[PDB]
Amino acid sequence: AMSRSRPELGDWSSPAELAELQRSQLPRVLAQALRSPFYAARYRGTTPPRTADDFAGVEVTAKQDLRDQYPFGMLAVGREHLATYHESSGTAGEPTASYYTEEDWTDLAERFARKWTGIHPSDTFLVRTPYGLVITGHLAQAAGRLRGATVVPGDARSLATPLSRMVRVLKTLDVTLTWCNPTEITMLAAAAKAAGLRPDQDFPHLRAMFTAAEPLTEVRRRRLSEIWGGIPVVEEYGSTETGTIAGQCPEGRMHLWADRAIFEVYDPRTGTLSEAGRGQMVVTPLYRDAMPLLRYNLADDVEVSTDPCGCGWLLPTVTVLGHRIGPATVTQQRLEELVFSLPAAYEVMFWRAKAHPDVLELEFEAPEPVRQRAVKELGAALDRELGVPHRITGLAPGTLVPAEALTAQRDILKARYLFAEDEDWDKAVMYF
Amino acid sequence: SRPELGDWSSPAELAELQRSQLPRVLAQALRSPFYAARYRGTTPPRTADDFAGVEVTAKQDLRDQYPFGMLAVGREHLATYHESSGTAGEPTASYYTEEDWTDLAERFARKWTGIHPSDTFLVRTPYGLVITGHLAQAAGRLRGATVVPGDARSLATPLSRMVRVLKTLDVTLTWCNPTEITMLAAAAKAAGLRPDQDFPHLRAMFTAAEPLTEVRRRRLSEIWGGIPVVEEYGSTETGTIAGQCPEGRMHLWADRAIFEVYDPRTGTLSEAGRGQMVVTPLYRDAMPLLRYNLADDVEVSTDPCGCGWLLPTVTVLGTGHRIGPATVTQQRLEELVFSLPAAYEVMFWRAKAHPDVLELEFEAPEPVRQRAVKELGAALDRELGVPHRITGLAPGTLVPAEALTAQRDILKARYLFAEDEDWDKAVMYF
Ligand SMILES: Nc1ncnc2c1ncn2[C@@H]1O[C@H](COP(=O)(O)O)[C@@H](O)[C@H]1O
Ligand SMILES: O=C(O)c1ccccc1O
Ligand SMILES: O=C(O)c1ccccc1O
Ligand SMILES: O=C(O)c1ccccc1O
Ligand SMILES: O=C(O)c1ccccc1O
Ligand SMILES: [Mg+2]
Ligand SMILES: [Mg+2]
Ligand SMILES: [Zn+2]
Ligand SMILES: [Zn+2]
């Protein structure tokens, strides 16, 4: 590496060489970790870990530790070196703070930019995740700028950017790439149809859709691809606290970015850490100064395999998993496979289910002509695959996902205090 | 590379710094479909002298050329794409190269209070398509300040959460519109924090996007413990084109753009006086603008300022209503509302011009309400002489308690729920 310090795919040719690329960083990482109040307090009366060998003995860092240290208990650098500050999704009541130096950001941007489809100057990249405190909009934008793509900041959950306006942007700007959660991929598809555009034909420049943030079955991922004309739906896995830790290969598996972090699986029964198997995703990022994390337990239920993939990347794969009803165990993943196995022509995208002690209640939207078939087929799928008692109800479109979410436009107004006689002064101080 | 405050020592040297860029700027402008079509079949302007004759560019031209009619570079050289606030029905597209962004970031970073690594900077403006959030964030990154991306109009970041962030992160700088400054002050009290005492690290508040009287600006400062409220002037299409000096005048960033005043009656352009703000940015390659008429009503003065910056000053107006004998502007009413004593806590108000009467409502606590109505009535009598119907309202009437106190979990879509959970958050989870 003449110019770059941080590793790339191909700097190692064996699992043995990957482990050495990792362990060589641990002295710096362990020295940096001890600079934070949290780790200096953890190792108070003892000898701190310093060497790659000492790492074996290092205690897990829990989500609750990150919350107890709010806001800067995990901080290992002077505040003058921070570039951005972030907070996690979930509960507003117990915030999880994350923060990054400029150089931390180069590692974050590189990991997001590991998109098998590429990101190029030729791309127009719609970033359709929130920019409010969470990292996700900032992360995609930073990766877009790193690779020279035109970034369209769509934001998400903003009154400035309803779906109708995103559909017009996708079409008229010839957008080539999107970043949004998998539910937003279906929201955009429904908004396109309500504008009289066919997601499968009317966006010929759209070449890939980047997604994360929800457990996503291959059956649902394939349907989302088919809705949008058979283009790749490129999954990644991360968190505000870690950045992107795994990205899809051309074969459709997520591979751990183990050159940039030590990945371990925590068995909460035994409290053992292992390089692979089923249990809780544990991460030690190797290229971060501001907020060192030693064996941070994301508490996501994962399966990590060192088994080779068809792609040939020399990295482990990860599946992210994320209610029992009499004899059967019913998961969202299993129901999602059954819902998204209904024929595409039935247009079933929006659904929800509740586990009662004795019965699974499930609702979905479908057009009237196909609704009774969709109810019957999905019932028979549940009988055949799970054998749970069910109450399935088909609903009119606009019942779960209202028409106004899909078609309403909103002016981006500023506060006004003086109105003409014929104006609505309801928009005076509450103008959003 | 690009000029800094102090690189010119006279108005004559400033004009030379400008005119020297015009050949490049005029050549770049002609690369766009719009300007190539405008000067089709004629000889195009090429020299600093030719600039005098150049036709104004209207906001309607930017709308008519949606999306990339104003584009002077290959799309491969674009860094970001933006759209303006106002009507959703007629989008105004703008776009910038990486080098365009350095000029934008430098102009925003011209804050007389500075932006430093020692700063923690809450950006509380939208990131959704408009430039505003992205502009403040790029300036914070340029100057090394810790950027806290608050966003605005996002379900992710309600006022209650911004107030907790202001306090617990020791935020030193904010960027938000002047109404948001009062919204945050009301939200702070609802969270049990006194804006005038409980934010000791807050040192300055940056604001723009509303016509702002000195009387209102001073009150916003007093609400937040007497710290500077630093106004700038800009637009979603240009970024910051003027910034406040320590004397409280906004100075035009004329080293980065030629500023002219348009008389719409005659279509005469002038270096100073009354009329419509016209801007020709000098360091803007993706989307060249020749004499872009912002259509803001402004007064430009070349008079020297005590601050010692050798740049013209600008006052920004906004067009008001006849009510019997008198003409009432928002700015005039705002001066009267914000001349009520601070202890009355009149911040939220609205008014309607009828042909015969000014209807005005504001929130004030019950003990002060009748005095506030009487004093404000006498101010209107004394200053405007318009008939008025003034009503005092309970706090929570114009700005509801919910907007100030509601917390909102940042949920993701969920499809399987337990019996006792709210499944209304399944697909509509915002
Ligand atoms: N591709 C994915 N599949 C499943 N869950 C995901 C995926 N990406 C992100 N997540 C979830 O989202 C979390 C990130 O949370 P946050 O930092 O609050 O945005 C992860 O810890 C997972 O629980
Ligand atoms: O909410 C989202 O849209 C989202 C998308 C990707 C990653 C994290 C997120 O919160
Ligand atoms: O869920 C997230 O916040 C997230 C953040 C970074 C990258 C991928 C992700 O899903
Ligand atoms: O909407 C805002 O809060 C705002 C603030 C500053 C400048 C432009 C803006 O729209
Ligand atoms: O919209 C504004 O009034 C504004 C002001 C300064 C900078 C960016 C902006 O959009
Ligand atoms: Mg580019
Ligand atoms: Mg810094
Ligand atoms: Zn693979
Ligand atoms: Zn001055």
Author numbering:
A (entry chain BBB): 0 to 321, 327 to 436
B (entry chain AAA): 4 to 321, 325 to 436
Task: Tell me what the authors wrote about this structure, in their words.
We reconstituted the biosynthesis of the benzoxazole moiety found in nataxazole by adding two enzymes (NatL2, NatAM), to 3‐HAA, ATP, and Mg2+. We have determined the structures of both NatL2 (homologue of BomJ) and NatAM (homologue of BomN) from the antitumor nataxazole pathway. NatAM catalyzes benzoxazole from this ester by a mechanism that we propose involves shuttling of protons to control the fate of a hemiorthoamide intermediate.
We therefore soaked the co‐crystallized AMP:3HAA crystals with salicylic acid (SA), which lacks the hydroxyl at the meta position. In subunit A, two molecules of SA are bound but no AMP. The carboxylate of SA2 makes a salt bridge with Arg156 that orients the molecule. A simple in silico change of the SA2 molecule to 3‐HAA2 molecule and combination with the 3‐HAA1‐AMP adenylate allows creation a model for the second reaction, the attack of hydroxyl (not the amine) of 3‐HAA2 upon the 3‐HAA1‐adenylate to yield the ester (not the amide).
